[PDB]
Amino acid sequence: DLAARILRDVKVELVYNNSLHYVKIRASVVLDRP
Amino acid sequence: YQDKVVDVEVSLGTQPIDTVGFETPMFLAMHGNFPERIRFYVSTAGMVAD
């Protein structure tokens, strides 16, 4: 590879940022707390 | 006898060498578009030209 002057093994990694599509919520009503 | 006050030898050990490559495929089709036996293409737009 040095003789032919060619570099091959470059590597990269990325983490794409997913947008939000759906949401689910749980609510509750209480009178007191221990 | 010698004819040079200083003499220098230089030798290059950087000779490149042919290598095989495991990438390029072949498809053996039937046609008469070009006279030679093999043609290389980098895109379909090149093939449509021929």
PDB file of C-alpha atoms in Angstrom:
ATOM      1  CA  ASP A   1       0.000   0.000   0.000  1.00  0.00           C
ATOM      2  CA  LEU A   2       2.859   2.403   0.697  1.00  0.00           C
ATOM      3  CA  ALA A   3       4.384   1.523  -2.676  1.00  0.00           C
ATOM      4  CA  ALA A   4       1.066   2.173  -4.429  1.00  0.00           C
ATOM      5  CA  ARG A   5       0.342   5.160  -2.140  1.00  0.00           C
ATOM      6  CA  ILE A   6      -3.180   4.105  -1.159  1.00  0.00           C
ATOM      7  CA  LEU A   7      -4.775   4.395   2.290  1.00  0.00           C
ATOM      8  CA  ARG A   8      -7.878   2.265   2.841  1.00  0.00           C
ATOM      9  CA  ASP A   9      -8.941   1.602   6.421  1.00  0.00           C
ATOM     10  CA  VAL A  10     -10.302   4.994   7.516  1.00  0.00           C
ATOM     11  CA  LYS A  11     -13.431   4.462   9.616  1.00  0.00           C
ATOM     12  CA  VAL A  12     -16.048   6.828  11.032  1.00  0.00           C
ATOM     13  CA  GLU A  13     -19.129   6.478  13.230  1.00  0.00           C
ATOM     14  CA  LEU A  14     -22.094   8.804  13.714  1.00  0.00           C
ATOM     15  CA  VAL A  15     -25.257   8.820  15.829  1.00  0.00           C
ATOM     16  CA  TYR A  16     -28.212  10.255  13.929  1.00  0.00           C
ATOM     17  CA  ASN A  17     -30.687  12.325  15.958  1.00  0.00           C
ATOM     18  CA  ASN A  18     -34.155  10.781  15.679  1.00  0.00           C
ATOM     19  CA  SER A  19     -37.062  13.211  15.786  1.00  0.00           C
ATOM     20  CA  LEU A  20     -40.094  12.429  17.942  1.00  0.00           C
ATOM     21  CA  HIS A  21     -43.268  11.070  16.341  1.00  0.00           C
ATOM     22  CA  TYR A  22     -45.550   9.723  19.091  1.00  0.00           C
ATOM     23  CA  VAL A  23     -46.041  10.269  22.820  1.00  0.00           C
ATOM     24  CA  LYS A  24     -47.933   8.384  25.523  1.00  0.00           C
ATOM     25  CA  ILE A  25     -48.619   9.703  29.018  1.00  0.00           C
ATOM     26  CA  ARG A  26     -49.875   8.181  32.268  1.00  0.00           C
ATOM     27  CA  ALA A  27     -51.565  10.490  34.770  1.00  0.00           C
ATOM     28  CA  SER A  28     -52.955   9.824  38.230  1.00  0.00           C
ATOM     29  CA  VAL A  29     -54.855  11.588  41.004  1.00  0.00           C
ATOM     30  CA  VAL A  30     -54.277  10.828  44.688  1.00  0.00           C
ATOM     31  CA  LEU A  31     -55.486  12.160  48.029  1.00  0.00           C
ATOM     32  CA  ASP A  32     -52.345  11.666  50.140  1.00  0.00           C
ATOM     33  CA  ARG A  33     -48.863  10.169  50.278  1.00  0.00           C
ATOM     34  CA  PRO A  34     -47.411   7.816  52.924  1.00  0.00           C
TER      35      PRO A  34
ATOM     36  CA  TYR B   1      43.411   2.240 -10.603  1.00  0.00           C
ATOM     37  CA  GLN B   2      40.450   4.508  -9.868  1.00  0.00           C
ATOM     38  CA  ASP B   3      39.064   7.478 -11.776  1.00  0.00           C
ATOM     39  CA  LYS B   4      36.963   9.306  -9.157  1.00  0.00           C
ATOM     40  CA  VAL B   5      37.997  11.035  -5.959  1.00  0.00           C
ATOM     41  CA  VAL B   6      34.497  10.276  -4.629  1.00  0.00           C
ATOM     42  CA  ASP B   7      32.023   7.697  -5.906  1.00  0.00           C
ATOM     43  CA  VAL B   8      28.474   7.098  -4.699  1.00  0.00           C
ATOM     44  CA  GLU B   9      26.068   4.264  -5.459  1.00  0.00           C
ATOM     45  CA  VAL B  10      22.319   4.735  -5.097  1.00  0.00           C
ATOM     46  CA  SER B  11      19.773   1.907  -5.236  1.00  0.00           C
ATOM     47  CA  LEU B  12      15.983   2.211  -5.077  1.00  0.00           C
ATOM     48  CA  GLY B  13      14.002  -0.474  -3.272  1.00  0.00           C
ATOM     49  CA  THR B  14      10.607   1.090  -4.005  1.00  0.00           C
ATOM     50  CA  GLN B  15       9.578  -0.950  -7.052  1.00  0.00           C
ATOM     51  CA  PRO B  16       5.771  -1.349  -7.183  1.00  0.00           C
ATOM     52  CA  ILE B  17       4.265  -4.745  -7.959  1.00  0.00           C
ATOM     53  CA  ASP B  18       1.095  -5.824  -9.733  1.00  0.00           C
ATOM     54  CA  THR B  19      -1.727  -7.069  -7.507  1.00  0.00           C
ATOM     55  CA  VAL B  20      -5.070  -8.826  -7.938  1.00  0.00           C
ATOM     56  CA  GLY B  21      -8.386  -7.246  -6.975  1.00  0.00           C
ATOM     57  CA  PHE B  22     -11.482  -9.099  -5.749  1.00  0.00           C
ATOM     58  CA  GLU B  23     -14.110  -6.502  -6.723  1.00  0.00           C
ATOM     59  CA  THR B  24     -14.919  -6.188 -10.405  1.00  0.00           C
ATOM     60  CA  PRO B  25     -17.572  -8.603 -11.735  1.00  0.00           C
ATOM     61  CA  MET B  26     -18.271  -9.727 -15.283  1.00  0.00           C
ATOM     62  CA  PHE B  27     -21.488 -10.330 -17.207  1.00  0.00           C
ATOM     63  CA  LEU B  28     -21.227 -12.306 -20.455  1.00  0.00           C
ATOM     64  CA  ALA B  29     -23.993 -10.941 -22.675  1.00  0.00           C
ATOM     65  CA  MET B  30     -24.995 -11.378 -26.326  1.00  0.00           C
ATOM     66  CA  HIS B  31     -24.682  -8.392 -28.653  1.00  0.00           C
ATOM     67  CA  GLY B  32     -22.622  -6.723 -31.356  1.00  0.00           C
ATOM     68  CA  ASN B  33     -22.339  -3.142 -30.090  1.00  0.00           C
ATOM     69  CA  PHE B  34     -18.535  -2.968 -29.806  1.00  0.00           C
ATOM     70  CA  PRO B  35     -15.800  -4.992 -31.537  1.00  0.00           C
ATOM     71  CA  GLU B  36     -13.525  -5.834 -28.608  1.00  0.00           C
ATOM     72  CA  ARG B  37     -14.337  -8.581 -26.120  1.00  0.00           C
ATOM     73  CA  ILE B  38     -14.573  -6.599 -22.854  1.00  0.00           C
ATOM     74  CA  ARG B  39     -15.673  -3.096 -21.877  1.00  0.00           C
ATOM     75  CA  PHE B  40     -15.637  -1.510 -18.421  1.00  0.00           C
ATOM     76  CA  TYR B  41     -18.360   0.882 -17.269  1.00  0.00           C
ATOM     77  CA  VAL B  42     -18.775   3.076 -14.190  1.00  0.00           C
ATOM     78  CA  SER B  43     -22.485   3.855 -14.634  1.00  0.00           C
ATOM     79  CA  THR B  44     -25.486   2.930 -16.746  1.00  0.00           C
ATOM     80  CA  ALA B  45     -25.286   6.309 -18.486  1.00  0.00           C
ATOM     81  CA  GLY B  46     -22.068   5.112 -20.098  1.00  0.00           C
ATOM     82  CA  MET B  47     -23.712   1.914 -21.316  1.00  0.00           C
ATOM     83  CA  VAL B  48     -26.633   3.800 -22.851  1.00  0.00           C
ATOM     84  CA  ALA B  49     -24.090   5.821 -24.839  1.00  0.00           C
ATOM     85  CA  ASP B  50     -22.683   2.708 -26.524  1.00  0.00           C
TER      86      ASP B  50
END
